[PDB]
Amino acid sequence: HWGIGKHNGPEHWHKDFPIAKGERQSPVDIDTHTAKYDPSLKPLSVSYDQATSLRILNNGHAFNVEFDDSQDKAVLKGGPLDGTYRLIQFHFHWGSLDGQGSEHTVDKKKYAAELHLVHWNTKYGDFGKAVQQPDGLAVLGIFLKVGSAKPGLQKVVDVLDSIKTKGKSADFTNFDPRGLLPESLDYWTYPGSLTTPPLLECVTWIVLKEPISVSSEQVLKFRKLNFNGEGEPEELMVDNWRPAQPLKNRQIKASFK
Numbered sequence: 405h406w407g408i409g410k411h412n413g414p415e416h417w418h419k420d421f422p423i424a425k426g427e428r429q430s431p432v433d434i435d436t437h438t439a440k441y442d443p444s445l446k447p448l449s450v451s452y453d454q455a456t457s458l459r460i461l462n463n464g465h466a467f468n469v470e471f472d473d474s475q476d477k478a479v480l481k482g483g484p485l486d487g488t489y490r491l492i493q494f495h496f497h498w499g500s501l502d503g504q505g506s507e508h509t510v511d512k513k514k515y516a517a518e519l520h521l522v523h524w525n526t527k528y529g530d531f532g533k534a535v536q537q538p539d540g541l542a543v544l545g546i547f548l549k550v551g552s553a554k555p556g557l558q559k560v561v562d563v564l565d566s567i568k569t570k571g572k573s574a575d576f577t578n579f580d581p582r583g584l585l586p587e588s589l590d591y592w593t594y595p596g597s598l599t600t601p602p603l604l605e606c607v608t609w610i611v612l613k614e615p616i617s618v619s620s621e622q623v624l625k626f627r628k629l630n631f632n633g634e635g636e637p638e639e640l641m642v643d644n645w646r647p648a649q650p651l652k653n654r655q656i657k658a659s660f661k
């Protein structure tokens with residue numbers, strides 16, 4: 405069930421997607437005192453210098469910035485991953501208030517928003533085939549807290565007026581996603597799922613410990629988008645996050661002592 409479309413509340417998804425009650429669902433709470441350092445993890449390699457952004461789309465549940473993934477231009481490797489994973493799109497989840505909005509939590513703390521950079525394993529040839537595999541995707545998660553403005557984010561905030569309603573898109577070329585990363589690449593990792601329908605259990609999650617700060621005025625502009633299509637009754641695009649799901653039989657590993 406991916407693509408342009410409104411979603412109902414996450415508590416109803418299990419009626420259409422039974423995997424919503426599965427064994428490796430995301431997001432989860434990260435208990436920092438139970439995650440174990442893993443000296444086996446190799447260092448993480450983010451290679452975004454040749455990234456090619458194309459378009460920004462309001463898909464009725466978030467906005468996606470889409471990349472050319474027809475070649476290895478923007479890739480993720482190392483860490484817990486085997487193989488090369490190609491960036492296809494990034495998007496955010498955010499709240500109606502600064503005290504809520506993230507999907508993952510850290511010792512039950514909620515951040516104001518969470519950025520997801522989605523990558524697919526090139527040995528499966530394309531995104532559609534990759535989501536049918538347990539190691540098909542790698543999603544880099546980054547928390548946002550409210551404080552100083554993030555310069556690298558402002559070109560994104562600037563174009564949201566042109567994609568206010570469901571189904572609208574705008575050109576979005578030459579955007580450099582390195583401007584959204586924090587200073588440190590220390591992370592937690594665990595096996596999980598997509599956090600929207602169809603909720604497939606195909607993701608290796610890499611969640612960064614250091615948040616980035618964005619300004620109150622930047623997040624206020626996220627809250628002006630609409631879930632609805634033009635000419636329909638107005639619904640503000642807020643609180644588009646899924647709550648923490650049971651960890652079940654999984655261990656969270658840390659890249660740092």
Ligand SMILES: [Zn+2]
Nearest residue numbers: 495497520599
């Ligand atoms: Zn997401």
